[PDB]
Structure 1
Amino acid sequence: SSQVEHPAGGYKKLFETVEELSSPLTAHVTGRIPLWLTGSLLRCGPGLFEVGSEPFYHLFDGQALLHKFDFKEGHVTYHRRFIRTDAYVRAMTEKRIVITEFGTCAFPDVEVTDNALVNIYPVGEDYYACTETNFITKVNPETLETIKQVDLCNYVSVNGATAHPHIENDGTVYNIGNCFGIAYNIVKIPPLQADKEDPISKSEIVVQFPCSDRFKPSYVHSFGLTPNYIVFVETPVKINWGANYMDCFESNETMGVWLHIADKKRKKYINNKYRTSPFNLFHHINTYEDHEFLIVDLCCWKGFEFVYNYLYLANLRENWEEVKKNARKAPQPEVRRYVLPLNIDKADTGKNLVTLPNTTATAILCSDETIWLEPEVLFSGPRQAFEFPQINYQKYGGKPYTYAYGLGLNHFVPDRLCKLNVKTKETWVWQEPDSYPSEPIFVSHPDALEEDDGVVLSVVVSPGAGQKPAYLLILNAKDLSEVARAEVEINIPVTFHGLFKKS
């Protein structure tokens, strides 16, 4: 949990327009930057929150800005370029809002947004900025130049795809998106071949999940992947002149949450009706196999009201007392472990199927063959969200694991970084006053012996009066103790997701 109030209201700088750079600034380093940390931290966020006099209204509306902290020769540089999407380019041309964003209608004076403000990920030897639509944007990871717009609909049958693809060690990319049978399609993009042809052209649908409602797909933000299984969590947040995307969402009050598994290698949906209470879900933490069971660790929001309702820029820019009051009736954040039995015997009707020795999660087989789940709670703090989770993905993604790292939200305001032992429930916190960190990204020591041998990187906004406005923070993953800090003399807005590109 957090240990601060924010009466000074410095978090407002997260939601303030900035200018791009012509070329990289040098950052001033305090501490020793590890010699083995060579590469680029790339992150996406909104950078332009109005077009002239026309405001963007929602957190997910501001125009995509690609950021890079570069570690070479012990020195550190910062660079940022707006992504030259159709949304951004037409806005610059017409000097107004041309494309409708998540929570802002453009008025003429369905063109789907390609405002790729959410994440960046590798396909083959390319990198793509994304949002959650059919449009992803190829970008240059060195120069931050925009290369091209790609429309997934040219290749596969999806209406969109998440900003949270899973990537296997061989470069194979999995993702999920809404489609028509309404269903949800798992997309697979292969690694780059010898033939060197663009892997996107080899995309295919490998498996389809059914939808709880004939005409209304659930919003899907992420999903789980293990070596053998795909996990999809179907939540009660449903998609139904001048409307935006937000206006189409509604809450199904009666369905609760439906959980779904598919055999990855046999490409089969499994007909197990996993059921539980209502929650929002944005981020899976990790998923893994333990005997005949899937362990499904989730960042939940307890409630069926759409949490994005609380993320309009006007509300996030209020003073601190009003921000707390605004969150009073929001869903409560909670890290939960669910355990899904794979080997279900009808003889166990009426009983708890979760026979594992080290969990309190349950799964009750009912007579109608629904399997009713209760979670093991891993972390719970009043309006203190463990969110934007990251793990040692390369080695522990899809596998038995012990540690997650997260961004701590205090009434939706990011004000700390956290580490969670998912087995013992012990936590560690890094926090300084009037400091607003980003999602922590884990980078493994090249000679790691243990899961947490490495560092986490976070971009911190520190708007205090006698302060460099922002800095790249490097923590030791062991205990979240500070290793170094690379300060810059310009503001940095909120960033959502990214990656560390080793070189």
Structure 2
Amino acid sequence: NKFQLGFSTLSEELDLESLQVKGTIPKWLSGTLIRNGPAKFEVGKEKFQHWFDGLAMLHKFSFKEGKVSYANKFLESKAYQSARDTDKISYREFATDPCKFTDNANVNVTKIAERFVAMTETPLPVEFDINTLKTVGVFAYDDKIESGLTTAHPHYDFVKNELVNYATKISRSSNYNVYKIADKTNHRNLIGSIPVEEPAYMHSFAMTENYVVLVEYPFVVKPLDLLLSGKPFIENFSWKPENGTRFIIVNRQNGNLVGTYKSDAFFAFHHVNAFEKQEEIFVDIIAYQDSSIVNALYLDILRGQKTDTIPTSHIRRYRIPLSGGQVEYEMLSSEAVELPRINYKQYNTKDYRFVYGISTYSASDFANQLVKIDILRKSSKIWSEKDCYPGEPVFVGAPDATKEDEGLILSAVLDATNAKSFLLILDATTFEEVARAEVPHHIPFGFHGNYFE
């Protein structure tokens, strides 16, 4: 297992004004890339069981006139602080329990009320200073919306300047609570509540011009099992394919229920994009046949000699006829893909042509390719390098760009032979390297990051 290092702890935290750059970083890149992910997979003798359990570490790539600065710090969550100060796992994670939700916000980062927050799937984000990467603390919402489970995949409406997300109240009468947050406030407005007997694990959701679409995979929990069983969070979820998948369509301006539609069972972590066209909604999803991927992302499998056991996902375009009818899909590409990203700022909620992601096709290795899928031409461009494992491709559009793929792709890449990571900058159009910046250590395999101007 050459990539074993990507799932090993990084204890080193440093701050460097300049990384060694090769190539040239465009002058117009003047923002900051923040990467989030797990970077500590044990506390004393106690090991975290699952990739999703690792204690959050932020990585900062800040750009000035062709130079790039780097800093990394562990998020000083109560989860981290308690582990550091008692050498005991102290909060319940995705798949590990101690020997009252974790604030181990290891999944994604965004801005709420002009503040930088790290996010996981527990109710409250964790605020951090982008200058220092210091932790300010739990970011409280100012509202009466009940939640136990949420996403670290909020959507953002650039027209209305609203963050959009949902949170599940998990109780004997559970609710999916769809909400929005206006710029310069931490108050969430409830759009709508959908009552549900057995809440589904929905890592992300779709947003169109007029709608939120919750795609309810039949991977579901009995609320009382979560409240009372001895078992870590994710062990309480069951695959029930007889339920099918349910597309719940909510008007995200007035909370009206547009309708519910069923397809055959499938599972997904990541939506790609969705859009309305005539009397139809198209929903592009990185779909697995079932939920078995969840058990494949336990560390003993990820570190083991059986990684061809890890199920592949593919881009499915689901067509919802609002007129009425069963939801059918077609494949947009033959490539196995995860960690999808688009020209979000210009093409989220809109008809589009280009998806960036990591190849999980295993042509030559595990997760060793960046891929750019051309939906129109049904073709792909590939980036790879011997014994290198690239992270999520973050797209940044060029100034006054007239094309969907005019800009840069930023990917944190593990170099296994060098036992250190580099930031790869591709031109999004050619999908060829324009620069890289060396990091003095390995960046463990992370989840999501965002570029802030």
Matched, 1:277 2:264: yes
Q: Which residue of 1 aligns with 2:191?
A: 206
Matched, 1:307 2:293: yes
Deviation (angstroms), 1:10 = 2.3
Residues 45 and 493 in structure 1, CA contact (< 8 A), matched pair in contact too: yes
Matched, 1:378 2:332: yes
Task: Report SS of the residue matched to 2:149.
Answer: coil
Q: Which residue of 2 aligns with 1:435?
A: 388
Matched, 1:456 2:409: yes
Matched, 1:174 2:164: yes
Q: Which residue of 2 aligns with 1:425?
A: 378
Aligned counterpart in structure 1 of residue 208 of structure 2, from 226, 243, 254: 226
Distance 2:287 2:419 in 1: 35
1:262-306 deviations in Å (ceiling 9; x for gaps): 1222320123x4111111111111111111211111110012x34
Task: Report SS of the residue matched to 1:478.
Answer: coil
Alignment of 1:55-454 (within 5 A): 55-107=47-99, 111-152=100-141, 155-169=144-158, 170-179=160-169, 181-192=173-184, 199-200=185-186, 202-211=187-196, 214=197, 216-240=198-222, 242-271=230-259, 273-303=260-290, 305-319=291-305, 322-324=306-308, 326-327=309-310, 330=311, 332-342=312-322, 344=323, 365=324, 371-381=325-335, 385-410=336-361, 413-454=366-407
Deviation (angstroms), 1:182 = 2.1
User: For residue 87 of structure 1, what is the amino acid of its counterpart?
Assistant: A
Task: Report SS of the residue matched to 1:314.
Answer: helix
User: For residue 230 of structure 1, what is the amino acid of its counterpart?
Assistant: V
Distance 1:67 1:221 in 2: 23
Distance 1:161 1:253 in 2: 23
User: For residue 216 of structure 2, what is the amino acid of its counterpart?
Assistant: E
Deviation (angstroms), 1:380 = 2.9
Task: Report SS of the residue matched to 1:395.
Answer: helix
Aligned counterpart in structure 1 of residue 428 of structure 2, from 441, 459, 477: 477
Distance 1:208 1:252 in 2: 23
The number of residues matched between the two structures is 442
User: For residue 268 of structure 2, what is the amino acid of its counterpart?
Assistant: L
Distance 2:221 2:142 in 1: 19
Aligned counterpart in structure 2 of residue 14 of structure 1, from 6, 17, 30: 6
Matched, 1:27 2:9: no
Deviation (angstroms), 1:157 = 1.9
Task: Report SS of the residue matched to 1:48.
Answer: coil
Distance 2:175 2:90 in 1: 31
Residues 390 and 442 in structure 1, CA contact (< 8 A), matched pair in contact too: yes
Task: Report SS of the residue matched to 2:338.
Answer: strand
Distance 2:9 2:258 in 1: 47
1:180-200 deviations in Å (ceiling 9; x for gaps): 6522111211111xxxxxx11
Residues 101 and 113 in structure 1, CA contact (< 8 A), matched pair in contact too: yes
Q: TM-score, normalised by structure 1?
A: 0.85
Distance 1:488 1:468, change over 3 A: farther
Task: Report SS of the residue matched to 2:84.
Answer: helix
Deviation (angstroms), 1:176 = 1.1
Deviation (angstroms), 1:410 = 4.7
Deviation (angstroms), 1:127 = 1.2
Task: Report SS of the residue matched to 2:19.
Answer: strand
Task: Report SS of the residue matched to 1:27.
Answer: coil
Deviation (angstroms), 1:388 = 0.9
Q: Which residue of 2 aligns with 1:4?
A: none
Deviation (angstroms), 1:151 = 4.4
Residues 468 and 487 in structure 1, CA contact (< 8 A), matched pair in contact too: no
User: For residue 128 of structure 1, what is the amino acid of its counterpart?
Assistant: V
User: For residue 332 of structure 2, what is the amino acid of its counterpart?
Assistant: L
1:400-438 deviations in Å (ceiling 9; x for gaps): 211111122256942111111222321111111211111
Q: Tell me which structure has the larger Cα radius of gyration.
A: 1
Q: Which residue of 2 aligns with 1:362?
A: none
Residues 468 and 488 in structure 1, CA contact (< 8 A), matched pair in contact too: no
Task: Report SS of the residue matched to 1:220.
Answer: coil
Consecutive unaligned residues in structure 1, runs of 5 or more: 1-8, 193-198, 345-364, 366-370
Task: Report SS of the residue matched to 2:3.
Answer: helix
Distance 1:209 1:339 in 2: 22
Q: Which residue of 1 aligns with 2:225?
A: none
Distance 2:12 2:431 in 1: 31
Consecutive unaligned residues in structure 2, runs of 5 or more: 223-228
Distance 2:114 2:139 in 1: 15
Task: Report SS of the residue matched to 1:459.
Answer: strand
Task: Report SS of the residue matched to 1:404.
Answer: strand
Aligned counterpart in structure 1 of residue 33 of structure 2, from 30, 33, 41: 41
User: For residue 319 of structure 2, what is the amino acid of its counterpart?
Assistant: V
Q: Which residue of 2 aligns with 1:360?
A: none
User: For residue 174 of structure 1, what is the amino acid of its counterpart?
Assistant: V
Distance 1:476 1:63, change over 3 A: same
User: For residue 302 of structure 1, what is the amino acid of its counterpart?
Assistant: Q
Residues 18 and 70 in structure 2, CA contact (< 8 A), matched pair in contact too: yes
Task: Report SS of the residue matched to 1:26.
Answer: coil
Task: Report SS of the residue matched to 2:180.
Answer: strand
Distance 1:152 1:161 in 2: 13
Task: Report SS of the residue matched to 2:326.
Answer: strand
Q: TM-score, normalised by structure 2?
A: 0.94
Task: Report SS of the residue matched to 1:260.
Answer: strand
1:78-98 deviations in Å (ceiling 9; x for gaps): 210000101001111111211
Residues 24 and 79 in structure 1, CA contact (< 8 A), matched pair in contact too: yes
Distance 1:455 1:22 in 2: 26
Residues 208 and 269 in structure 1, CA contact (< 8 A), matched pair in contact too: no
1:20-40 deviations in Å (ceiling 9; x for gaps): 424236311110111111111
